[PDB]
Design a protein around this ligand. Structure first.
Ligand code: BK1
Ligand code: CA
Ligand code: CA
Ligand code: CA
Length: 426
């Protein structure tokens, strides 16, 4: 395997997309699957701030982050000059451009959007990761479709790498001017984002960066602009709690998510339309509940690494409607209510075994990291057709994602292609 790069052997570079933090971001495509991905290329010599052992450790945790509103990293690969961080490709651009186009949003539309930031940030903070620089330019739109998920990018690598080289000043908490970060800085930044969403203007506005940072110094903002009068007191109460000056008195990410104003506007719930879609989710999980253990884990690794938007976009809607508390993961109770609601909408009396014992029995097989929750990939794994999950191209990639040494055959420590194909086609 001498004349083969790890990145080069697997992905072709299509084109540059942008200059990201710590290095360039490019569009690349898998040479077998043809599926396209974004890749950030980071120069080792120049950007390295830690040893590679620390960098690969840090990035591994970032890869294991599983949340609909957080960018999904697939892998970190290296050659003699660079690191290559490969992730989901988004096509909808920055939330920032949405602000410019719409100028500002209804309480409904601002609620649906910021709810997703709260969801992602809450998950980030549960895993002890602060963004440090939350802003509209670091929130990407998944696609061009209407109510598409937003995706928080660009965090986690801050001690690993070193940058070299406008408008960030609007979003920085005051404590950050004191050289301090903590989880409450992200809340502040998200409060500013929200104020801009509902009003179209930042709370600490000014002509240049000196004067912007001067108002941010004082902590003084108001709901003075004429447009604030036809905006509820509930949005005002949330902003006030987020733009509280002292971090210790400022609300958490979770309380942002749980705020009454959030609850009121983002209550999309399951309907008759979802029944056939929901019926498809059932069949595929129903065997996943009694499908082999080596099958269950092997399926989780495939659907998690090699899916695409247009494939799982249906499961994505269903997931959302079951996610009644809006944190981006499915707990035990939400599944049970969803199973009750499913039956009710179909006309079948719930009150074999009960819905409650069936879910109780499903959770251990379904929650495979033992998280207590059913994260997005665990759902997709379970509730997708293997009729479309299993194409030759994907098996070919899978086959090579486990053969570490590059033999043409798999060893026991790691865990023929035709013997591979039959195993997965059971
Ligand atoms: C704004 C345009 C330069 N861009 N930027 C990204 C973010 C991104 C892509 C690939 C790897 C990453 C690793 C760490 C942090 C962010 C990464 C990105 C994306 N996902 N999809 C489309 N465009 C993107
Ligand atoms: Ca949930
Ligand atoms: Ca889990
Ligand atoms: Ca091998």
């Amino acid at each position: 395997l001498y004349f083969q790069g790890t990145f080069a052997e697997r992905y072709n570079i299509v084109c540059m997309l942008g200059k990201g933090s710590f290095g360039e971001v490019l569009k690349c495509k898998d040479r077998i699957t043809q599926q396209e991905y974004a890749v950030k290329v980071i120069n080792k010599a120049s950007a390295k701030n830690k040893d590679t052992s620390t960098i690969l450790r840090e990035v591994e945790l970032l890869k294991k982050l599983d949340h609909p509103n957080i960018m999904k990293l697939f892998e970190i690969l290296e050659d003699s000059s660079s690191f290559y961080i490969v992730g989901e490709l988004y096509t909808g651009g920055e939330l920032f451009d949405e602000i410019i186009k719409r100028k500002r949003f209804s309480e409904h539309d601002a609620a649906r959007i910021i709810k997703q930031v709260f969801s992602g940030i809450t998950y980030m903070h549960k895993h002890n990761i602060v963004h440090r620089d939350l802003k509209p330019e670091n929130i990407l739109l998944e696609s061009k479709e209407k109510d598409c998920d937003i995706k928080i990018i660009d965090f986690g690598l801050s001690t690993c790498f070193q940058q070299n080289t406008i408008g960030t000043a609007y979003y920085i908490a005051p404590e950050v001017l004191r050289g301090t970060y903590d989880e409450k800085c992200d809340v502040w930044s998200a409060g500013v984002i929200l104020y801009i969403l509902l009003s179209g203007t930042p709370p600490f506005y000014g002509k240049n960066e000196y004067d912007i940072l001067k108002r941010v110094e004082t902590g003084k903002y108001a709901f003075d602009l004429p447009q604030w009068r036809t905006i509820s007191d509930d949005a005002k109460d949330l902003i006030r709690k987020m733009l509280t000056f002292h971090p210790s008195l400022r609300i958490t990410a979770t309380q942002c998510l749980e705020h009454p104003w959030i609850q009121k506007y983002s209550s999309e719930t399951p309907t008759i339309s979802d029944l056939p879609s929901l019926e498809s989710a059932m069949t595929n999980i129903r065997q996943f509940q009694a499908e082999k253990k080596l099958a269950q884990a092997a399926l989780l690794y495939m659907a998690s690494k090699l899916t695409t938007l247009d494939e799982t976009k249906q499961l994505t809607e269903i997931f959302r409607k079951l996610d009644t508390n809006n944190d981006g993961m499915l707990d035990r109770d939400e599944l049970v209510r969803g199973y009750h609601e499913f039956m009710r909408l179909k006309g079948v009396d719930s009150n074999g075994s009960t819905i409650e014992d069936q879910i109780d029995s499903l959770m251990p097989l379904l929650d495979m990291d033992g998280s207590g929750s059913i994260e997005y990939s665990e759902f997709i794994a379970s509730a997708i057709d293997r009729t479309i999950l299993l194409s030759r191209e994907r098996m070919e990639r899978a086959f090579k994602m486990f053969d570490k040494d590059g033999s043409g055959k798999i060893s026991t420590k790691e865990l023929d292609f035709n013997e591979f194909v039959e195993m997965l086609q059971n």
